[PDB]
Design a protein around this nucleic acid. Structure first.
Lengths: 51, 130, 124, 94, 50
RNA sequence: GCGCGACCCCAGGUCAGGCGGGACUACCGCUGAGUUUAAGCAUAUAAAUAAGCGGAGGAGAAGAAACUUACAAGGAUUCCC
RNA sequence: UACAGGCGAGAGACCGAUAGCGAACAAGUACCGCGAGGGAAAGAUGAAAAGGACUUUGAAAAGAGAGUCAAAGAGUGCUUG
RNA sequence: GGAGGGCGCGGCGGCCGAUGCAAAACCCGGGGCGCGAGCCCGGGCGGAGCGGCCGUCGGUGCAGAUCUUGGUGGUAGUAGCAAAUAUUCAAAUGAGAACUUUGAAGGCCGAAGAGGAGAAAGGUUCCAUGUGAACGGCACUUGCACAUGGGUAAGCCGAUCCUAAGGGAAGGGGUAACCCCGGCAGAUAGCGCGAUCACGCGCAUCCCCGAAAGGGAAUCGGGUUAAGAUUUCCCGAGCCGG
RNA sequence: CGACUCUCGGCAACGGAUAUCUCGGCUCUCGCAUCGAUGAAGAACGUAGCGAAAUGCGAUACCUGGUGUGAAUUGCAGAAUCCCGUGAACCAUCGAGUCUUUGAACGCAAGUUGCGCCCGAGGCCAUCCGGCCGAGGGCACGCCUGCCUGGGCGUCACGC
């Protein structure tokens, strides 16, 4: 069999993978100031992603 | 507080508007006091500036510098003038922000639309005085 | 390009036929700047934002032209599945526009129907 | 063997799966219904006993709303003005 | 079907296959097998690719 | 048969148009608990309330008496005292 | 006559970051749960980054000098501490 | 337990004072006052607003509540880090090597494997390169970590197509309604085939989903990269449907 | 007899209380009416030169026309015509627009980017003036109104 093929789940996996990226240095200056320590970067070994 | 059914009055609201300044808000807060020679020509005490003006530091510690206005910054309402600077450790020179109120206008570029501002405000000052 | 191309009022002063040829060129040009996106060129920098705006301008104006011609054709007859959309903004406002008040008092009690003070006095 | 350890370890069945409408794992597969909005369903699932936290989720915040707002503001649907054209027009008032 | 037509319009070449890949980007990567009668190398130069 | 009109009843991806869902603060209906209180608890209380469900508007409902009264009679409807 | 929503306003012997809303900050976010649902922690350098070049030790992180600052007994553990 | 007379805090109306030439705050085996509640003053720290007095008012005073929330001890450098037969030597590298990497050696699982793969599940973890701040409860230059890049290509494999148990629109009818049985006057309401020619002929229990396991239109070989290759690629040969 | 045990101060480390701040909350009051099959509320996934996020937007994609203002945007890069100007701007206004994939969600289903049907034009060549291929958008339930082929002694006349 495939490894659940359905597009609705598949797109979310792609989106979340893109989302789980670090905050990019430059923007911390172009926010004024406020510690942009993302939060929406998760790691697979810990927690669980809901659909 | 003091009187009148109007839109605007709230200590929080006054701060909120002027910090993040929409374009009309920027220009009215970009009004910088004229030097005395210019005050008697255009018959106003203050007008919005430009970038091809020249502006002299009167108020601060930095007093005595003159330069052209290099940039104007919306996001934290500040203006940046040439030669009012602080030195970084390596020897780089970076501009120090100055408020438009502090600095006083040496020289004007008239323009055409900016010129219209001078005429309307001048007419304003004529009406009350006489 | 490295400079921005053109201004909206210029495109207004060009024909529908002229601007569709321009639109083809803009799309071709965009694909060049997309490969240069990877390169990080100073040429594409400003330009790749601005070319999308150029594409948008030509598409808006041609559509507006079609609607104008359509309206002139339609105004004689009974009409509009398209212009009807713009006129209303539908459902709540649609129920409120029979015109009730005038129509009810169009017949029965209308000869004498209102207070004088003037009007009935002035006109006799 | 018994409870907890053996309860966790199997889990090779699926019930609640991704809903298309609301984007929440709540679609009960073998009874084909979403328990977070109703997926086949004429009406969206609304409960007025389900209080603070849940109600606000369904109120949304990925909303448009601004697009809708502008017709409320004007109330009309027209306007007309094309000033600022070489002549020097009427494009600098007072 | 559409992409084979598009390649023919814009680069004047016959395409023999098109192959479709989902990416984690959320867009589709296309490997497009081209004709040996006009070589992909000399197509490449005018829309440069590394 | 064919019955001009039509009678009665069907069918159009039919001609021009219309309905669902939302909002549900507030409102108009429907439908409807128990904890609680009675130092217990059923009648009763909570409450013709909460929950459940539908539907509109900027307000809505109401509305020119098959009324109130028992008077030298008041006088649609609403809200406050 | 109504108005704990929405939009656009005016105010309060309101609260002052364990308080105030769940959320002053990316908050209904991160995260938790199979789900229904549950749901945080988290504001302050300074006037201006003037966010410590350079020299030196150390594998580096750092340290020591120095530079800067009105003040580093203000060095993004940052006002007071 | 009552009443009485006070003290302290926050804010408000009054009134008076204090301040970058150093406010408030905080510290102080420093002084002094009051029975106390508390107050006063000095020195140190600090850097922008505050206190006294007369009225007014409270979300107004803490030691607890198997208290709530945050911090921090003793415990304690103590219990421990003991299952899985097991490591060792030399070299390479590096600042640093019992653990990395290579060889040599010793072993172990003992083909119902500690194996080569697929399902399910996770989602980039695979591999390169960079590389030790956190993390791998030892260590560490190594990592399934962190950073930076790349990678999954099908007429023939699966899904798709198809039916099952079963689910569910459509009808009638209850139920305000949600919702539930489930079809009816698709039965002289139309879907299907000739048929191009407009017309005739024929028929239901419909119609979709439902096993990425049932059932099934159709591929093999070699080569390749970081990897599964009938599958990517390529040669050569097919095979199925239109 | 060091030490230990204890205690304090001075300087610190610890910790984030306290004070002083506050583009915020909170509560009251006022004005206002204004969603949708003409495709909503809500979601999904993309789009910024360099973006993870928020915010903005939708293949016309951090935006467009038009209009106002009248020169910035800024972390760095950049354009230099857009600077005495039909015109800068994470700008405001935003009347004219696009407005993806979904969703009441409508061809039919949906653990399927699944499976149909219909129409458009451009090109081809005439095994026919047809065949083949192209890009776009439709084709639901519900019921009114008007409409056609008719069912039926439903009812009448007229049939041979």
């Amino acid at each position: 069999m495939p490894s659940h093929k359905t597009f609705r789940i598949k797109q979310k996996l792609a989106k979340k993978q893109r989302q789980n990226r670090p905050i990019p240095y430059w923007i911390r200056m172009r926010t004024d100031n406020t510690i942009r320590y993302n939060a929406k970067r998760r790691h697979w070994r810990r927690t669980k992603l809901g659909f | 507080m003091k009187r009148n059914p109007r839109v605007t009055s709230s200590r929080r609201k006054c701060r909120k508007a002027h910090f993040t300044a929409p374009s009309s808000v920027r220009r009215v807060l970009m009004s910088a006091a004229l030097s005395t020679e210019l005050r008697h020509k255009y018959n106003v005490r203050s007008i919005p500036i430009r970038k091809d003006d020249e502006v002299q530091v009167v108020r601060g510690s930095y007093k005595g510098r003159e330069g052209k206005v290099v940039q104007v910054y919306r996001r934290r309402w500040v203006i940046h003038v040439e030669r009012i600077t602080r030195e970084k450790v390596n020897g780089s020179t970076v501009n120090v922000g100055i408020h438009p109120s502090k600095v006083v206008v040496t020289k004007l570029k008239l323009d055409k639309d900016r010129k219209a501002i001078l005429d309307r405000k001048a007419s304003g000052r004529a009406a009350d005085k006489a | 390009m490295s400079s921005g191309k053109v201004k909206a009022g210029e495109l207004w002063n060009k024909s529908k036929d002229d601007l569709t040829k321009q639109l083809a060129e803009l799309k071709t040009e965009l694909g060049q700047l997309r490969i240069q996106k990877v390169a990080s060129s100073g040429s594409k920098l400003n330009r790749i934002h601005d070319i999308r705006k150029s594409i948008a301008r030509v598409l808006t104006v041609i559509n507006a032209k079609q609607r104008a011609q359509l309206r002139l054709f339609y105004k004689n007859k009974k009409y509009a599945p398209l212009d009807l959309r713009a006129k209303q903004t539908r459902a709540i406002r649609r129920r409120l526009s029979p015109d009730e008040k005038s129509r009810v008092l169009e017949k029965t009690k209308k000869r004498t129907v209102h207070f004088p003070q003037r009007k009935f006095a002035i006109k006799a | 063997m018994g409870k907890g350890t053996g309860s966790f370890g199997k889990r090779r069945n699926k019930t609640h799966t991704l809903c298309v409408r609301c984007g929440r794992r709540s679609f009960h597969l073998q009874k084909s219904t979403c328990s977070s909005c109703g997926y086949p369903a004429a009406r969206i699932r609304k409960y007025n006993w389900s209080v603070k936290a849940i109600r606000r989720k369904t109120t949304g915040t990925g909303r448009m709303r601004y697009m809708r707002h502008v017709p409320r503001r004007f109330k009309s649907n027209f306007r007309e003005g094309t000033e600022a054209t070489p002549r020097k027009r009427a494009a600098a008032a007072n | 079907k559409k992409i084979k037509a598009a390649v023919k319009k814009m680069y004047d070449i016959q395409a023999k296959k098109v192959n479709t890949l989902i990416r984690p980007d959320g867009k589709k990567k296309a490997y497009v097998k081209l004709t040996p009668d006009y070589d992909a190398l000399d197509v490449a130069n005018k829309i440069g690719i590394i």
